[PDB]
Amino acid sequence: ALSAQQLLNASKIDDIDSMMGFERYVPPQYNGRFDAKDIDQIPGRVGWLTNMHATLVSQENQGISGVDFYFLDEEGGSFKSTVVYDPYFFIACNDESRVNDVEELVKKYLESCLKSLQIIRKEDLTMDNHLLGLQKTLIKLSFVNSNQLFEARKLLRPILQDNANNNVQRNIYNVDAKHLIEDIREYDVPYHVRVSIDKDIRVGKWYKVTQQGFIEDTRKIAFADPVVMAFDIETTKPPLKFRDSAVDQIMMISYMIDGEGFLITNREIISEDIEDFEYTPKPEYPGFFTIFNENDEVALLQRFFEHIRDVRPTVISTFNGDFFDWPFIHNRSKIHGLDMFDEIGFAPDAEGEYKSSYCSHMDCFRWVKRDSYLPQGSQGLKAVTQSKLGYNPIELDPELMTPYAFEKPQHLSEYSVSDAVATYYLYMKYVHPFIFSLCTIIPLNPDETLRKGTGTLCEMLLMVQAYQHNILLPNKHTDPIERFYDGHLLESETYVGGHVESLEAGVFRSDLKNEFKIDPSAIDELLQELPEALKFSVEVENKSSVDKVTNFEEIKNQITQKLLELKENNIRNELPLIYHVDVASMYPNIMTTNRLQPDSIKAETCARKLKWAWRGEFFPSKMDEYNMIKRALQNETFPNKNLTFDELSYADQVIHIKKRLTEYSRKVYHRVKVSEIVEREAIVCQRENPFYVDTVKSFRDRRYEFKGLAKTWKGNLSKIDPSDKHARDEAKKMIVLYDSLQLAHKVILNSFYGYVMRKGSRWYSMEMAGITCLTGATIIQMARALVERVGRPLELDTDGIWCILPKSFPETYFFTLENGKKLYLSYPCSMLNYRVHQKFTNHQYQELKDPLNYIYETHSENTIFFEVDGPYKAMILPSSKEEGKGIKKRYAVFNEDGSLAELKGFELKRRGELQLIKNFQSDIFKVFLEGDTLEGCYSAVASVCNRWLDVLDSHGLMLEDEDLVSLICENRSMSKTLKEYEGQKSTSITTARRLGDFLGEDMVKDKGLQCKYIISSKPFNAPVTERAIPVAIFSADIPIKRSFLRRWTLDPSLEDLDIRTIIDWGYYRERLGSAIQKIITIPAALQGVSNPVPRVEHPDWLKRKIA
DNA sequence: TAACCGCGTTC
DNA sequence: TCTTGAACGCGGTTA
Ligand SMILES: Nc1ncnc2c1ncn2[C@H]1C[C@H](O)[C@@H](COP(=O)(O)OP(=O)(O)OP(=O)(O)O)O1
Ligand SMILES: [Ca+2]
Ligand SMILES: [Ca+2]
Ligand SMILES: [Fe+3]
Structure with missing residues (x-):
């Protein structure tokens, strides 16, 4: 078979x-x-x-x-x-004394596929006295191949399903070897x-x-140095539509092989032959490129395969080549009577990605998706090159790519080649080291280490640990179809995650004094602390001793004097210090501090009870109304799927049940979902086999190694004399290299925490996650309570706080030890870190000292530390249009040298928002640095505001036509195809339908479409989703343009097809306006500054408050 | 107005 | 089949 x-x-x-x-x-x-x-x-x-x-x-x-x-x-x-x-898996029994008799059953039941049996023992973390050495007995079934393993699973699952069902009825007037198979284990590895x-x-x-x-x-x-090849293919594209392998022909394929590289053209579309040229976008990335211009397109494909066959590449890299390039080459080879698999050994797999046996296919877009830490808007190869390689690659409009085959062909070859060098060097500098290093610890092959989810990567790491400690793998978790709370069906349960506050908007710069109120008891608190906090700073924060440090007293005194001055001068109007505090790897360090582990939470010292916050979303329907809705659906007739309600799958029964319960409750209550949060406690055993914590602790240290190197080379750049351009060039490159590696590890790291709630997780625990978060909430709010009493916190997110501090607040000091070296100290940092370590340390952490006699010691662990970055030059926090509300997760921070430090949340970074607001924000935030006073600062930003306002009050006349196309477009993406959005109305949704009637259903065939649209004034006072014009229409023939433009505006006799008249400038004026009040005017108000852009009126509540 | 949703960010 | 989490801003619709 x-x-x-x-x-x-x-x-x-x-x-x-x-x-x-x-x-x-x-x-x-x-x-x-x-x-x-x-x-x-x-x-x-x-x-x-x-x-x-x-x-x-x-x-x-x-x-x-x-x-x-x-x-x-x-x-x-x-x-x-x-x-x-x-291959093997295990059978588990619910009675150890009779394990032998199950063998005699499965030896005969599975005579059809089993090679050998055996009785083995493993540690089972769900078994009593397992920490005393008691082990679970198991039957190890082994096989000759994996298909035979699968057969035995098909034979065992009925026994397991049957066993879970009540035994049959024979003599009612008063066990079978089968009924003792409790479960199978490690069957899905x-x-x-x-x-x-x-x-x-x-x-x-x-x-x-x-x-x-x-x-x-x-x-x-x-x-070793594998021979790596990267490639890019560019193809003909019929105007405004997409590239179809059936109709469209491949134009040229650019590629590189270990620094050298090549271009190959199909001269039947490329209007001439081509000479050998060079594109070296910067000296780090050489690129001398021979060419093989070929006659036929099949000459092109045969040339590519022939080259691949001669060089023998162990690694083939692409950029999204998994779903565009490789399928295009395959159908084009197929059409042309070439079987790709016989030629280069590649072929699609079960997920439709192209793989080979000898050569890993490294699609950099998968790296960029998972591990680059880039926003989605920066995930195209253009932005990836600018960010990671430091240069601007050749841009060329698609719509020109097919024409420029004939018109300007050498220019097009200069583009196709750009994409080639950009991906080869992206792979060699970032993807290749990181992925191959990962394979040395994760038991997968390159193609899998690249593509699998970060939670799966964690799972792989954890399984190694579990196996090497002889720990039996739990089976994958399974979420129930229905869960209930106080008799209500639950639509969703979860825990309360991070705690984040918006506290203050406005502009803050180091050269513009603010006023602080200082809690005098707070500084009296710090004073009864800093003797032991400075000891903490040396003994715990730098792993030194006071015995070997000299100027301890002198430093202890400078700080104390300053603090005293602030205790008497509570009220001050000074120049600010803009600082940021952040716990290094908060959740990992929280888990390791508390021995947090799915296998560590139980019921029924050895017990550290920690609280978490459960939050459920249910229907207010009581059970009486549920049971009523059910039998109602039972009597009705339902369409088949190639029948009765009870003949449907149990899943679909609850799908229908959920819909009917949704509508019924809205009638009786109008309140469809009820949300409640419950304080819960769980015990966290401190002696459980710590294979999970240790796996996290190890991967954290692994990551810390690269985050430390970044701090090292960021320092090595402070001592780089600004003249030596080559020294600072290599230093700046090392930093981009180690910030990347440290961030690539960060997602995998924190996925050890998220893994605990992932679907199909082998170590599921809602409890552990909630405990992790609530503790983080407590630490961050304890830190805010202090800064509040000693400064002004600006913004706060789960583990970080942006705050402002007097200039007179103790900041940086440098101890001197007997070895002549120095020790760094940020007093605001060690201030919190000492309180962290007084109020959150685990004194119940235990560990096996003598494993032979099962003897444990108890010690104290705490690995939670704030770190500072700063002081910064400026911070700009927007404000909400509503009253009493702030805005979280959005701001701009500037470094001393006027460079942008952080830019969070705003639309300029997000993927495909309204370009106008993107360009506006890009032009606005640098201007907040100008001025000599706060009132003077807001005026400079006011001037640029009005400039942009003039653009829109003028109905877009100052912009040439080639420049307006871009400024008013809004380009948003569709996660799924259009058919999947039925019953929904959005601007993307109508843009796609209209792009479909106009250009064909062939356009919304695939998922992930970029809907580039324009809002029209017509029809008037229709909802905005109705007046969404695909920007593509303005580039089709006037016959087509007019018919649809009339359709989509319901003006059946219209002649003014000029793009400027269709646009609803009042809409865009409202949108730019909202941007200006959130970033400029309403922030200027809460800082005590009259409106600096009077053409954008204050909201009526703020017009009420100024009075 | 408040509930609610898709997207894409910050943690 | 494969599959880290929650909190959040903002257009925009729906009740
Ligand atoms: N992709 C993520 N998945 C799960 N949790 C995350 C993720 N990103 C951030 N977090 C969670 C866990 C973090 O410990 C916590 C705080 O995030 P954050 O401060 O950005 O990084 P971190 O503290 O974990 O590392 P770092 O040392 O860079 O600050 O929020
Ligand atoms: Ca390309
Ligand atoms: Ca952090
Ligand atoms: Fe215990």
């Missing part, structure tokens, strides 16, 4: 591997002792491991399961080696993952392949 498909594929894969330089190396035999102490002596071939794939092998009966491993050797070559390993965990093999490491197995050569340091 289905075996045949698999052994066939393995045969084909083997042939391609052979062709591309990957023969199966079988190592010599060896009958001597096999330890890694004696590596050079054992017969074998040492290689660097690049890939991993599951394969089936013949007797070299029904197929044997194994993994092919792809190595690069030290003699400039390549080989492949094969490990076989029997991907096979090749099972091999890399059990065999501790990882891609990126050096091994010598020998008869006894793989031997890691810890003596080889640096990775």
Whole structure:
């Protein structure tokens, strides 16, 4: 059966591997002792491991399961080696005394597919006295291949389903071996993952392949250098529509191979032949490019494959090439009678992504999506190049790409080549090191380490730990179909996450004094503290001792004097210090501090009870109204899906049930969802097997290593003499390099926290998550309470606070120790950190000291620390249009040298908002730095405001036509296709429908469409979603333009098709206006400054308050 | 007005 | 099949 498909594929894969330089190396035999102490002596071939794939092998009966491993050797070559390993899962019993009798049943029940049984023991974290050494007994079923593993699962699931059902009825007037199978375990482990965990093999490491197995050569340091190729394809595009592989033909393919690289053109569309040129967008990224101009498009495709076959690439990189480039090449090869798989060994997979056996396909867009830490608006290759490589790549409008084949062809070749070098160097500088390093710790292959979710990455790491501590894997979590609370059906439950406050809007600059009120008891509190806080700063914050530091007293005194001056001069009008405090890796450090772990929460010291906040959303329907709505739906007739209500799937029954319960409650209450929050407590055992905390602690330290290096090189740039341009160039590049790495790790890191609530998680715990958050809320609010009493907090988000402090507040001091060095001290930082460590430290942390006698020690752990960045030059916080409301998660901060430090939330960064507001915000925030007074500052920003206002009061006359197209467009995206939005009205939704009638259904075929639209004045007083014109229409033929423009404005006889007359300038004027009141005018009000843009009227509530 | 939704950010 | 979390701003509709 289905075996045949698999052994066939393995045969084909083997042939391609052979062709591309990957023969199966079988190592010599060896009958001597096999330890890694004696590596050079054992017969074998040492290689660097690049890939991993599951394969089936013949007797070299029904197929044997194994993994092919792809190595690069030290003699400039390549080989492949094969490990076989029997797939296995476990059967668990609800009575240990009778485990043997289950074997005699499953040995006969699964005679059809099982190779061997065995009785094994594992630690089960859900078992009593497991921390005393008691272990759970299990039956290890092993198999010859993975299909036979699957068969046994199909045979076991009825037994497991039946066992969960009540036994039948024979003699009512007063156990079976089957009824003792409690569950199956570790049945859903991907096979090749099972091999890399059990065999501790990882891609990126050096091994010598020998008869006894793989031997890691810890003596080889640096990775081998695989031959990496990146490629870009550009194709013809019929105007305003999209590129279709059926009709459109490939124009040219640009690529690079280890620095060199090439262009190949289809001269049947490229209006001439081409000369060898060079595009070196900066010296770091050379690019001398030969060309092969070819006659036919099939000559082009054959040239590409022929080149690939000759160079033998272990890595092929692209940019979104997974879903555009590779499928386009395949259909074009198919049309032209070329089978891609026989040519370069590539083919789509079950998710429709293109893979090969010998060569990993590295789609940089997957890196950019997961690990670049870039906003979505900055996730196109243009912005990625500017951000990560530091240069501006060649821009060329698509609509011109097909025409410029004939008109300006050498220019187009200069574009296609830009995308090529930008992705090769993006891969080599960022994707290649990070991904391949990750493979050395995560048991997946490059293609998987690149593409899988960060929660899955965590899961992989955690499974290694669980396995190597002999801990039995929990089965994947399963959310119930219905959960209830006080007799109400629950629509959603969750915990209360981060705590964030908007406290104050306006402008704050270091050269413009503000007024502070200082709580005198607060400074009296700090004074009865800083003796032990400065000791804290040396003994805990710098791992030193006061015994070896000299000027302890002198520093203790400077600060005290300053504090005293502030205690008598409570009221002051001084120049501010703009600071930011942030806990380093707050949630990770919170989990490790508290030994937080899904396996650590229980019911029924050894007990650290911590509180969390549960919040449910339910219907106010009581059960009586639910049971009523159900049987009502039971009697009705329902369409099939290729029947009765009870013949539908239980899932669909609740789908219908939810809809009917939604409408019924709105009648009886009009209140459809009720939201309640409950304080809850959970116990957190302090002695549980800490395999989870430790996995987090390790990955944190791993990340901290790169965040530390960034701080190191940010310093090394303070001492770079501004003349030596080459020194500061390399320093600035190292920093971009280590900020990237540290941020790439950050998402994976905090995914250890989110994993606890991920669907299908093996370590689910709503409790642990809520505890993590509520504690974070408590720490951040304790920190705000102090700064409030000693300064003005501006904004606060979960773990960070932007605050303003007098200039007379103690900031930075430098101890001097006997070794001559120095120790940094930010008093505002260690001020909070000492209170953190007085009020949140875990004194109940326990750990195995003597494992043989199960003896535990108790100590105190706390790894929660604020860090400061600052002082900054300016901060600009917007305000809400409503009264008494602020705006969170939006602001602009400026560094001393006038550069932009942080720019949060605003539309300029978000993906495809209204370009007008984007350009306005880009032009506005730098201007807040000008002026000599606060009143003078707001005037400068007022001038640029009115300039933009004049643009719109003039009905857009100052802009040439090529410039107005951009300023008024709003380009928003559609997560799904149009058919999936039925019953919904939005501006994207009508823009897509109209783009569909006008250009064909072929346009909203795919998901993720960029709807570039314009709001029209007509029809008048119609809802704004009705008057949404696709910007594309203004570029079609006047026949088409007029018919639809008349349709979409319901003005059936209209002749003024000029774009300027269609636009609803009052709409855009209202939108720019809202921007100006939120960023400029209403902030100017709460700071005590009359309106600086009088053409934007204050709201009626603020016109009421000024009085 | 208040509830509610899709998107895309800040944590 | 694969799949980190919650809090939030803002257009815009709906009750
Ligand atoms: N992608 C994310 N997934 C889950 N939680 C996140 C994510 N991003 C931020 N957080 C959560 C966990 C964080 O500990 C917490 C605070 O975020 P944040 O201050 O930006 O970074 P961090 O404190 O975790 O690292 P850093 O040292 O860079 O400050 O919010
Ligand atoms: Ca391209
Ligand atoms: Ca932080
Ligand atoms: Fe306990």
